[PDB]
Amino acid sequence: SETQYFVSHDGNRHDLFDTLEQAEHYILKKNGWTDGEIAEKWAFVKKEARKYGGDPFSSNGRHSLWFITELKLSDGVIMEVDGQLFDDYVESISAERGTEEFAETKRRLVGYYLGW
Ligand SMILES: [N+]
Ligand SMILES: [N+]
Ligand SMILES: [N+]
Ligand SMILES: [N+]
Ligand SMILES: [N+]
Ligand SMILES: [N+]
Ligand SMILES: [N+]
Ligand SMILES: [N+]
Ligand SMILES: [N+]
Ligand SMILES: [N+]
Ligand SMILES: [N+]
Ligand SMILES: [N+]
Ligand SMILES: [N+]
């Protein structure tokens, strides 16, 4: 069992990273942070954004469209999306298992997350 961090921007897939810090670092570099700025300011910006409902990845004072999703996998199978059992997640945005709607929704998400 292994956790990976999936970075997306405005619906577009970027990468799967092994740790949260790697995923965060990638977004910050994408947003033009210097390596100096990250080491001196990121921990503070992330906690203050946490504390007051803001987007720590905001480049202009508004939601950045960046997201980090936490995937748990076993043998390359997605088991959980942000702590929620995958099939439960698919059901909540579509229909229940057994329906073609469920099968197509999970199929697209599987390919989306794994970069097919
Ligand atoms: N994508
Ligand atoms: N990139
Ligand atoms: N990387
Ligand atoms: N990193
Ligand atoms: N780093
Ligand atoms: N990008
Ligand atoms: N700390
Ligand atoms: N600070
Ligand atoms: N503060
Ligand atoms: N914030
Ligand atoms: N946050
Ligand atoms: N699963
Ligand atoms: N089923």
DSSP string covering the chain, please?
-EEEEEEEETTEEEEEESSHHHHHHHHHHHTT--HHHHHHHHHHHHHHHHHTT--TT-SSSS--SEEEEEEEEETTEEEEETTEEHHHHHHHHS--TTSHHHHHHHHHHHHHHHT-
Phi-psi region for residue 72, left (φ > 0), alpha (ψ -120 to 50) or beta?
beta
Whether 81 maps to a domain, the answer reads: no
What letter represents residue 82's amino acid? D
- The tokens for 24 are 């965060």
Asked whether residue 66 is domain-assigned, the answer is yes
Residue 104 domain flag: yes
Longest dimension (CA), the chain: 52
Residue nearest to atom 1 of ligand 6 (CA): 30
Q: Is residue 79 part of a domain?
A: no
Ligand nearest to the CA of 67: 11
Same domain as 66, residue 29: yes
Distance of CA 52 to the CA centre of its chain: 20
Residue 19, both tokens: 């740790």
Find the domain containing 101 and state its range.
Answer: 86-116
Ligand number with the minimum distance to the CA of 31: 6
Number of domains in the chain: 2
Please tell me the distance between residue 48's alpha carbon and the centre of ligand 7 in angstroms. 13
CA 72 / ligand 12 centre spacing (Å): 9
Technique used: X-ray
Ligand 12 within 6 A of CB of 77 = yes
Angstrom resolution of this structure: 2.1
In a domain, 58, yes or no: yes
